[PDB]
Curated annotation (Swiss-Prot), chain A:
This is Anthranilate phosphoribosyltransferase. Its cofactor is Mg(2+). Belongs to the anthranilate phosphoribosyltransferase family. Keywords: Amino-acid biosynthesis, Aromatic amino acid biosynthesis, Glycosyltransferase, Magnesium, Metal-binding, Transferase, Tryptophan biosynthesis. Coiled coil: none annotated. Homodimer. Anthranilate 1 binds at residues 86, 117. 5-phospho-alpha-D-ribose 1-diphosphate binds at residues 86, 89-90, 94, 96-99, 114-122, 126. Catalyzes the transfer of the phosphoribosyl group of 5-phosphorylribose-1-pyrophosphate (PRPP) to anthranilate to yield N-(5'-phosphoribosyl)-anthranilate (PRA). Anthranilate 2 binds at residue 172. Its EC number is 2.4.2.18. The keyword Transmembrane does not apply. Mg(2+) 2 binds at residues 230-231.
Length: 349, 345
């Protein structure tokens, strides 16, 4: 078990056994060093999924991946930097909402460092919508570092930071269905921010994700809409896994308690890049309604997660602080301004 | 029934049985070169981990057989048998038992490949005995008429499965594809002794056979051999009249002494050939026992085609015929005729 091989690992997996410590790691390190055949890649990716990954296993996959990633330059990522992202819906996305909450959070003064890919890739999306807004998404360590210090936000394009993952990515594309690899995006942010709002379509995988962040002592809300959204929803309650101090705390959450009127799922989903970018422009310019509401809400969440790093402040007041700051970042036009600053940045860069 | 790979792989990774026809579509894509290696691999693995149904594996085998080169019309006797394991190898045992069964006058048509393939092995041992393994449909048919035995070389009869085969080799562990060898014999014999190393899947295998109205014994040694063992009991799934009957078989019931697993499994293709020669030549020992035993079973499966159909007396007949086929020199001589046949074609 501690002297690993592909047949040993896949066989343990096809036998529906949890992997021994280090096996997932060695599996990933092979795939990352060019020493795995496409069939071994696919077979590992698929079996890992069906067996039901563990926090340990996923943790090992994400760690190995980070060990090969390009870092950001030393001391350029603030210690309180946050991520805002969903691992993607069934065939759906909410990158409209997560893009808008990313921007709202940054404008409120919290450093946001994102990580993603263009659509229909196992590393999370978001790249295309940002490109449709005019954001230069493909920047090296140094300029992402500069973007984050100059604008208050940066985006780590996965192709650029995880080149050694190309083989896994191409295989993820051909399999053309979500695997355990689809979990990796929020756990493989190269800037390694210690906090975030992390949205997930699947409750079981969400709790495995909560577990991975807990081992890292991150302050994160892993959020699943009980309507299935990979975000805090306003159509109904959400489940939150509150990661903090190295433990997970599963909560039911309801935005009505904060004055959010109920909405209908299909008002929220989002669409392709151009569609998302029009709604970003619309909402950041003051368009009221349920999309805005969900953005303010998920931006609050990220802000609460931020609160959890250097504080053990109360749940309810941290949320009230979250909603006010997020609301004000939109209504003052600071979020709209931040996007135009973000767009100018790429063109001066 | 308007299928696609994301639809099939998503349903599989959801732990769901496929809808009727999806496995066939997936296999048919795999066989006509239209599947990506990653898709082949994912299908094969997902299918395994979900637990394949008899319908599913039936559809896979059905599709393979619809793409295969057939033997010429009227060249495979109605009662021809297969003698084969899915592989663990007992190629030593299946080979000898094959030759024994043929010598006793039951027509044998085998199907295999060289070592480690997902479609069964066995062709290395035969090459080593001087048997010509790479014969087209017409010469296999004639071997079967003249010699009493034929061997269908997988590459030769399932050329479109080369994409699946290679992916099988690459992922390097058993999957549902490891069942297909015994179910895709191009000569389509209706009876046989079918060894399966994986106890879970043996039953699924039996189901496929039954759906096709075969008379087979799917056998799994309770020590893990994909033949009837003599080290302990075996599980037999007895296929007949379209139904499956699960029994435990004990060789002690027929006076077979207990062996030890090291004494029984095979080895090198040269090593297997040497043992083939010793056993057909009269060597007594655990290997001979296991051979007699596996031929008997094939002859029992044969009996079972035409519904005389009584278990014990079928087995004492089977056992007499096997032992006599070795003891009279008929098995030794049959192989020599097989070797001579290839030399003169």
């Amino acid at each position: 078990a501690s002297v690993p091989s592909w047949p040993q690992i896949l066989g343990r997996l096809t036998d529906n056994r949890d992997l021994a410590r280090g096996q997932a790691a060695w599996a990933m390190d092979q795939i990352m060093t060019g020493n795995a055949r496409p069939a071994q890649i696919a077979a590992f990716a698929v079996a890992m999924t069906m067996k039901a990954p563990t926090a340990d296993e996923v943790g090992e996959l994400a760690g190995v991946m980070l060990s090969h990633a390009h870092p950001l330059p030393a001391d350029t990522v603030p210690d309180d930097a946050v991520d805002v992202v969903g691992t993607g819906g069934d065939g759906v996305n909410t990158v409209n909402l997560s893009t808008m909450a990313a921007i709202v959070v940054a404008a409120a003064g919290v450093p946001v460092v994102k990580h993603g890919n263009r659509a229909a890739s196992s590393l999370s999306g978001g790249a295309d919508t940002l490109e449709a807004l005019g954001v230069r998404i493909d920047l090296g360590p140094d300029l992402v570092a500069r973007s984050l210090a100059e604008v208050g936000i940066g985006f780590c394009f996965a192709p650029r930071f995880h080149p050694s993952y190309r083989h896994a990515a191409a295989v993820a594309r051909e399999i053309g269905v979500p695997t355990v690899f689809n979990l990796l995006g929020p756990l493989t942010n190269p800037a390694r921010p210690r906090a975030g709002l992390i949205g997930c379509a699947f409750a079981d995988l969400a709790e495995v994700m909560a577990g991975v962040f807990a081992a890292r002592r991150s302050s994160v809300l892993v959020v699943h809409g009980d309507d299935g959204l990979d975000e805090l929803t306003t159509t109904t309650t959400s489940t939150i896994w509150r990661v903090a101090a190295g433990s997970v705390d599963k909560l039911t959450f309801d935005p009505a308690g904060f004055g959010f009127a109920r909405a209908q799922l299909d008002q929220l989903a989002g669409g392709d890049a151009q569609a998302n970018a029009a709604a970003v422009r619309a909402v950041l310019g003051g368009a009221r309604g349920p999309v805005r509401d969900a953005v303010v809400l998920n931006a609050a969440g990220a802000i609460v997660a931020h609160a959890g790093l250097s504080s053990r402040a109360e749940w309810l007041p941290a949320w009230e602080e979250g909603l006010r700051r997020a609301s004000a970042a939109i209504d003052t036009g600071a979020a709209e301004q931040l996007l135009a600053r973000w767009v100018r940045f790429g063109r001066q860069i």
